[PDB]
Amino acid sequence: GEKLKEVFLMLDNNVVECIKEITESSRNGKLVFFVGAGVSTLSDYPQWWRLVDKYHEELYGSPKKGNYSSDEYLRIPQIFYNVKGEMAFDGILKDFFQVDKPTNPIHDKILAMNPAHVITTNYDNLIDTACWKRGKYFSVISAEEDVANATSSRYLLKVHGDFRKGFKGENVVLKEDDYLNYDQNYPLISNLMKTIIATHTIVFIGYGLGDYNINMLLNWVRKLQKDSFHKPFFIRTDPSPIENETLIYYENKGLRIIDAASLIDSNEYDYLERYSAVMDLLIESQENKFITKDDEVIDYIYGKISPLFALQYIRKIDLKHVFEYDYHFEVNGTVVRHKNKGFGYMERFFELKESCDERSKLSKKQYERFNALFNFFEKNGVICMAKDAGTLNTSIEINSLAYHGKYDVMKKFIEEQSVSIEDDYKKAFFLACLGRWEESYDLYSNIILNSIDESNGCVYYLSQINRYRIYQSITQAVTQPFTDEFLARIEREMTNFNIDDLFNGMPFEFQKKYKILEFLSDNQFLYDDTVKLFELTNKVRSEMSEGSYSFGMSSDIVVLLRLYDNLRFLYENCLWSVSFHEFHQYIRNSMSLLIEKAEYERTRDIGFFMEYYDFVNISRHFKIDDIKNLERSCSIDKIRFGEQEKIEEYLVGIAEEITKQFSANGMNVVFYTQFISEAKAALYFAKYVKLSEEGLGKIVKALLFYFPERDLDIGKRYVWLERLTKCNELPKSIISIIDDFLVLQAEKHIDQNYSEVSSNGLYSRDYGALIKHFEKNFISKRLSEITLCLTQDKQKQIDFLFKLLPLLSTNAKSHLLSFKSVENINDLMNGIRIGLIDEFTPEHEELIIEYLETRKVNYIVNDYMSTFGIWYFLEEINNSKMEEFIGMDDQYDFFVDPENFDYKKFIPSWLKNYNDKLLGKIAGNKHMKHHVIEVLKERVKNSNDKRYLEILMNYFI
Amino acid sequence: LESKRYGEKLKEVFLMLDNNVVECIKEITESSRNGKLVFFVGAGVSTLSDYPQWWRLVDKYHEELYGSPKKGNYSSDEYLRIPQIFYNVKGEMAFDGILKDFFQVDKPTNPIHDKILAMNPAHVITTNYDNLIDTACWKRGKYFSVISAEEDVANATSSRYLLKVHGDFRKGFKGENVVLKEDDYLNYDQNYPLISNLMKTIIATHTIVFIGYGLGDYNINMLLNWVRKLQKDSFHKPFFIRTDPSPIENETLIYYENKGLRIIDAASLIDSNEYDYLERYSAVMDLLIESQENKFITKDDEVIDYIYGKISPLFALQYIRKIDLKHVFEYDYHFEVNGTVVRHKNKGFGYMERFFELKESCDERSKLSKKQYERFNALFNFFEKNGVICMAKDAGTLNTSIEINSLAYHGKYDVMKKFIEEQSVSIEDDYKKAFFLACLGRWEESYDLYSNIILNSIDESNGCVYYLSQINRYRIYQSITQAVTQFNGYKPFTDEFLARIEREMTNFNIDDLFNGMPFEFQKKYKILEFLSDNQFLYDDTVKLFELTNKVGMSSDIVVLLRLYDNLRFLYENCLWSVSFHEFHQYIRNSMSLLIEKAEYERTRDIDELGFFMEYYDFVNISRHFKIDDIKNLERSCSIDKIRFGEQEKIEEYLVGIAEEITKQFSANGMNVVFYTQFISEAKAALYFAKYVKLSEEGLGKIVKALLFYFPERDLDIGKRYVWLERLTKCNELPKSIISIIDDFLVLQAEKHIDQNYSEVSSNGLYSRDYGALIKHFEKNFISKRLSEITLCLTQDKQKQIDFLFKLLPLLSTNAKSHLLSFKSVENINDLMNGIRIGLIDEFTPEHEELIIEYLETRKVNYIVYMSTFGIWYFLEEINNSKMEEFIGMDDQYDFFVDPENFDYKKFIPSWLKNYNDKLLGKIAGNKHMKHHVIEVLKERVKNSNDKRYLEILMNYFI
Amino acid sequence: GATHDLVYHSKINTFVWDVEFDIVLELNKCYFVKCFNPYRINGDFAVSSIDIFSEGKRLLEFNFKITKAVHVATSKDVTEIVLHLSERISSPFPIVKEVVYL
Secondary structure: OHHHHHHHHOOOHHHHHHHHHHHHHHHHOOEEEEEOOOOOOOOOOOOHHHHHHHHHHOOOOOOOOOOOOOOHHHHHHHHHHHHOOOOOHHHHHHHHOOOOOOOOOOOOOOHHHOOOEEEEOOOOOOHHHHHHOOOOOOEEEOOHHHOOOOOOOOEEEEOOEOOOOOOOOOOEOOOOHHHHOOOOOOHHHHHHHHHHOOOOEEEEOOOOOOOHHHHHHHHHOOOOOOOOOOOOEEEEOOOOOOOHHHHHHHHHHOOEEEEOOOOOOOOOOOOHHHHHHHOOOOOOOOOOOOOOOOOOHHHHHHHHOOOOOOOOOOOHHHHHHHOOOOOEEOOOOEEEOOOOOOOOHHHHHHHHOOOHHHOOOOOOHHHHHHHHHHHHHHHHOOOEEOOOOOOOOOOOOOOOOOOOOOHHHHHHHHOOOOOOHHHHHHHHHHHHHOOOHHHHHHHHHHHHHHOOOOOOOOOHHHHHHHHHHHHHHHHHHHOOOOOOOHHHHHHHHOOOOOOHHHHOOOOOHHHHOOOOOOOOOOOOOOHHHHHOOHHHHHHOOOOOOOOEEEOOOOOHHHHHHHHOOHHHHHHHOOOOOOOOHHHHHHHHHHHHHHHHHHHHOOOOOOOOOOOOHHHHHHHHHOOHHHHHHHHHHOOHHHOOOOOOOHHHHHHHHHHHHHHHHOOOOOOOHHHHHHHHHHHHHHHHOOOOOOOOHHHHHOOOHHHHOOOOOOOOOOOOHHHHHHHHHHHOOOOOOHHHHHHHHHHHHHHHHOOOOOOOOOOOOOOHHHHHHHHHHHOOOOOOHHHHHHHHOOOOOOHHHHHHHHHOHHHOOHHHHHHHOOOOOOOOHHHHHHHHHHOOOOOOOHHHHHHHHHHHHHHHHHHHOOOOOHHHHHHHHOOOOOOOOHHHOOOOOOOOHHHHOOOOOOOOOOOOOOOOOOOOOOOOOOOOOOHHHHHHHHHHHHHHHOOOOOHHHHHHHHHHO | OHHHHHHHHHHHHHHOOOHHHHHHHHHHHHHHHHOOEEEEEOOOOOOOOOOOOHHHHHHHHHHOOOOOOOOOOOOOOHHHHHHHHHHHHOOOOOHHHHHHHHOOOOOOOOOOOOOOHHHOOOEEEEOOOOOOHHHHHHOOOOOOEEEOOHHHOOOOOOOOEEEEOOEOOOOOOOOOOEOOOOHHHHOOOOOOHHHHHHHHHHOOOOEEEEOOOOOOOHHHHHHHHHOOOOOOOOOOOOEEEEOOOOOOOHHHHHHHHHHOOEEEEOOOOOOOOOOOOHHHHHHHOOOOOOOOOOOOOOOOOOHHHHHHHHOOOOOOOOOOOHHHHHHHOOOOOEEOOOOEEEOOOOOOOOHHHHHHHHOOOHHHOOOOOOHHHHHHHHHHHHHHHHOOOEEOOOOOOOOOOOOOOOOOOOOOHHHHHHHHOOOOOOHHHHHHHHHHHHHOOOHHHHHHHHHHHHHHOOOOOOOOOHHHHHHHHHHHHHHHHHHHHHHOOOOOOOOOHHHHHHHHOOOOOOHHHHOOOOOHHHHOOOOOOOOOOOOOOHHHHHOOHHHHHHOOOOOHHHHHHHHOOHHHHHHHOOOOOOOOHHHHHHHHHHHHHHHHHHHHOOOOOOOOOOOOOOOHHHHHHHHHOOHHHHHHHHHHOOHHHOOOOOOOHHHHHHHHHHHHHHHHOOOOOOOHHHHHHHHHHHHHHHHOOOOOOOOHHHHHOOOHHHHOOOOOOOOOOOOHHHHHHHHHHHOOOOOOHHHHHHHHHHHHHHOOOOOOOOOOOOOOOOHHHHHHHHHHHOOOOOOHHHHHHHHOOOOOOHHHHHHHHHOHHHOOHHHHHHHOOOOOOOOHHHHHHHHHHOOOOOOOHHHHHHHHHHHHHHHHHHHOOOHHHHHHHHOOOOOOOOHHHOOOOOOOOHHHHOOOOOOOOOOOOOOOOOOOOOOOOOOOOOOHHHHHHHHHHHHHHHOOOOOHHHHHHHHHHO | OOOOOOEEEOOOOEOOOOEEEOOOOOOOOEEOEEOOOOOOOOOOOOOOOEOOEOOOEOOOOOOOOOOOOEEOOOOOOOHHHHHHHHHHOOOOOOOOOEEOOO
């Protein structure tokens, strides 16, 4: 090896580039060997001059010894065939050629090169015997009836016949007439031979530079053009070195001779180590020891990287596949060696990087190639090795208008003039991201029809995948916007288009130079990342259940800076493949693990600061029930949210997009359904940000007024307004907004049958409560004027302005209570919910007696019953009649009779639902304390909620 | 309308064919699927979208040469001599001018230059001079290497050819770029050497379809002379599609059929006018496009052959998953794992629905043919074996109880070693032997015999023995590599071995194993490609994530009967690819979800506040968990209230583990490659063994194969005490376990006869505890042998005296007299062994002062056994006022010596799972201990899944 | 400077971190492991049993003024931080080298 590395250094400049071409064609599959009869005469198989001597022996007698010339090799077997016959000819064949010689190792080294085809001029059966011992299947095409009867696309093309069907002289090409009548006896093997020759790279491995077969291939290749073809390579293994004139003569005649005696030094009768000398120096397709200079590592890296300048970002996790499996690139820019049994070409590249004294000694164009590669590796975030690197940086930048939700400029970028196909590829991704799928499918089809002239298999392929995923978005759309002409042609051309057959039907330039673009046509994209989340999900949850507060190094950097490379390959390369929900569960379990880790490692008596990118993912990929799962478990209010000028402009970006789209007419039903989920999940997680007065006042106004119904109910807005007004404080502008909302609701009740459909049972009354929760001395002027212009009729509006009764003036309450009084339960339970009854007159409790009597009519064959048992429990009700309704509610019977209630019928809940005077008079009891403490204990076990613990600490113990 | 008139009327045309047209539709479409369909597009499809025909030019070539146009309608080769005489008399600057006049036009393509492209052909060869094909190729987004001159063949960019075989006009309208003159047809095979060879190589390596010609047409005759110079059907016959007005004579349909063509006529299929070609070309090329429709199965003897086409290669496999069978058939019929087929898209014939009806009801079964009946018998056995029974409509009895019947799954070693030493009769026999050798750790004969398999599956035609032996050989290579990276880089393999396995497995890409195969292993075995990567458990894992969220009818059947199909494809097909740890986490999260579900749905009194655990529900916990994972299950969910069945099958499994420990560790049996695999299963299997009620021979052969034969460095002396405790808290010691543990302690007593034997142990548990357990179930036990050992005891051997003072209550009275004629109390360790075997009832005040000097040396610690002194001070054993001086040294000593000055946020979440009933109960009989320990118990009933803190806080505090 | 390996187990109030003490209880290379046995049958009243090593168990009188504490494989003695953590946390053996967690 090392002495052959000295032979590697001891070559002319043609042998080395021929090693490059032979091995790169062995990698491409464009290497065809043409195996001869100098490799099959080692493992000695009876040579032809031996038979012509015997053909001279039984024909004339007295063997010649006047050493055999040219075509006299072929006329002595011919004169014989015309004088003696064929039953003697085919008998001498059966004598000499019916042997079994075991193969030499140089019928195996040809096979160890992985050739595309193997053509041979050998009559024997030693190649396929050598092919049989490696487990390789070759379609042995040795007669003319085998060509379309061939089974595999790998050929063992025995071009001069064979002896597998009998030792007769009619199955092979031995006589002189069989060489003259060859192109009319053998029509298909000849064409298939000379089609391989002009569509591959041919290497001769068994011949001499006489050898009439080679001359038959050198006449035909001389009848061709100005290098239509590629020159065949001849590998000459002879004892004497070649004359220089016959190395120039055959080089223009078509061959390119690699001599084997001008590379080593040996004896006269040892062929096996000349064949081994070239075929141990050609096998090094793995070794590639050609980069021993500082101007050849820069060209190796300019070979495996420089096609990838059309992409705008490449993941590190994909870059350990770009280079074969050495150099696992960690996501912090630190390269670790993995196997690399050879040259540290990356390690050499960093040394001819930053230190400039090795950089000046480069060539001219090698310096420019170094500049482009330095910009490339600097851009993607690869900086150094892992040894001399302690400053590993952070803060990635997805800089794409589609990620930041900055619509606002996309609509401005689309209406500009297009100057490129990469420009139209961004416009088509923006149109697709804006819901305008018709111009997207049209313009993506314009991309796949305009990427035919240029040579770029990463615009075409990725526009294909995006067109297929927008097809799945149209299909998933219409199964729940577009004309019926559209749905026909998109369900006409996307039929039978297999996505898994998109990658393996491409030219070889898009097979290896862009090999990382195949995890995208399936969901093998997030595989490694997800299986490196499962272990970390173990690793940080096994140490939460034993209290192992690691004082050393946290592992959140592994999750948080490997998620961010997934969101950056898609949006920076403008890929529509974001409409799949395994990305969503990856982000939900990722960010959920990061929040539980950051909250667990906060109360630890012995980062994750939530910047801008830590909010877009929660907004776009969660649901409202998922955020509620986070708030039930881990208190996110003790997090210290930064970038509150960037999340604020994001949320007023959401607020202005609700504002613009829902003012007169702006809603596409394909963009509304995408966007309104982000506007919902984004505005529920908006309590954690400290907004301004213009920040809050433009979100609250774009939630109460412009956020459309059927997706946010009137009482469903109350939770959201409550959160956004428990973080901040109402600066006499939110009061003006909610006041203007209630005046708007009051004027919608001027007609009948308006009923304020609401799930929660929360209504405009609660908005009035909140106003008199921060602004105790508030008097609405407009509601006062509405109630002062009130008449005998319009019974709905009177009830609405009795629910909102504390927001009125004194003349308004006089004229207003000149119409209503207490006549039923609903006016009573609105009566003490706005405050205007202080003590019960005993007609109220008897009215409750008739109401619960109708509840007895229920039990014989909106529940207000527990609010009567608790009024009986807090000593408001003064009656001995109300204890008769036992066995009707478990929560009424919990309070009217707290010694006969069966306490395994006590619900795990009901304790998160009680105030401070009730929880505290439950605690001021005996059996309520005894059993409610047990309920609180077992449901502090089987829950992740922190509220039951607060009840049991602050009130019971 | 058009789909129900042209389509359904064409389905009447489908019924109205001879038997040759239909099989030609089958061959043309299956070659369009294979990629062996080559169209040879002509000049009858490019004269629609009218492009100036040649007889128009020869007429003009006759006009400026002679004058007075002929009208004596043009014959044969006179088409070619009038452009030739011109070229010899008028010149070439007039020839190439008439070409520039007529051929320089731009005619937009017809839809039948697009229907040829809608067939997805492998190659497109054409004899057209124009540029309408590639214009039609440009509007579909297809890239063809337009090879129109001889310098284009190796200068071609893609392997899809638009082979313009007669020249082109893209480089100028000259008569030298095309084949138009008569001399250009004579001098064609010497002016055009490479396009001709590449043409006639495609013809004899594909299926050729002619789509634009007539049965005159000298080009076709040039291809019919050459194909006549061939052999006895070396080649395949070209198909001619003839679209002419008149129907063909029967004699010219017989004549050209033996000359080499196979004519599909287009006027013997429809009925139309004289001058309408576009709907004859449409009539055959709308009837040929139906590669998706396959409306050929409208009989009850053709659905059985469709199913015998897509299933019958898969009889060499021994099991196929249902989840893979929805990929075997294209994406209709989602097979649910209970044998219930649901329709998914299936816009056509219910061939499975028809197959079940010609199944069980026999009155449709009798009317089959002879060989179709045998094909039905084989397919019935196949679908019956894998567990597919019916549809989802008329099926309420969906069955259960799968059967992984493989010797390697059940851990039945015992017969593998007997099966391997038999005589081999097949390659499927050697494939099982090689999987058994690989499963027995004998990896050298495995890699040798797998290499013998990949060298012996060259003669037969089976790409599922070869491919799977390849994957197994690669995963055993990763097992050798992962082995030696812990072993060397205890000599398992020689250095000759590690060289050749790191010589041939270099540069073998696993992802290039599948896409380098013949096309028979590309589609007929398409489900064998999720195995070369870890896309095997993808769908199952992403249908666990939702159920993990989600948890009448329970949903445990969805998890428990989809796991079991994963363990059955690998072991029944004898696959070594079980050495990866995503399978493990899938089983751990699966079985962990099933146990938490089955335990959660057990205390449910309905208004709130199966999984019977048979044999297969134990092998997976054993082989795939760890001991800390089982402890995570026992900390959260009480598995003791589960009602474990098959306790004659789990018992024979665990005594199978016990006998394999017994045999291998008796004199010499341990291969270091099989020991490391097996001893993890023997550990995780014997920790989960408390839940099974064993016999006396069942327990007595596990306890003996744990105390005696289970080797050290993997189970410590005090580490065995937990395991023996569990296995003797489930059962009761029937005076045979007592004999085992007694024989163990006599064995340990005789190992202390020499010095420096120290009983290395992590837990601090020792042989004393074994003595305690013996006098925990057998209060009146007297060991005879330990009595004799202590009676033959002398002044020396100080280790053995101490050992037989830790085991002091297991002695006789003469043994304790002669034994306590040597020892007394001189330090802390003899005192805290003194009251741990029971022989001190009350403290004499020299003991407490000895504790004073001990804790004084603890003061020597704090200047630059303690909690057991503070608790003895707390349970009113210590009578001293000196011991309260050591404050600020332990938080648990200061919890008991001073329970009003201890800062109770320094009170550990634990320490309450560690106290007895007299301590927990005198903690509870206090004021501030109750006040703060109840708060600790409350917050750690919140932030824990353990059920023990709740038991403390219920049973002692409230 | 070895705080990248310092782990704080909080159910026994210790600091699992591989050091090798040099003590006067005069000994060299002494490391401590600690157990967490929940229901140790008969084995006094405690949570945690120290199991002192000196390349093998020590077989206990109990002094160990630690004079030279040195971190394994990233040396240059860490005695200052060990006395600091001994100053804050008041338990037996605040630096423990392994925890069993029974």
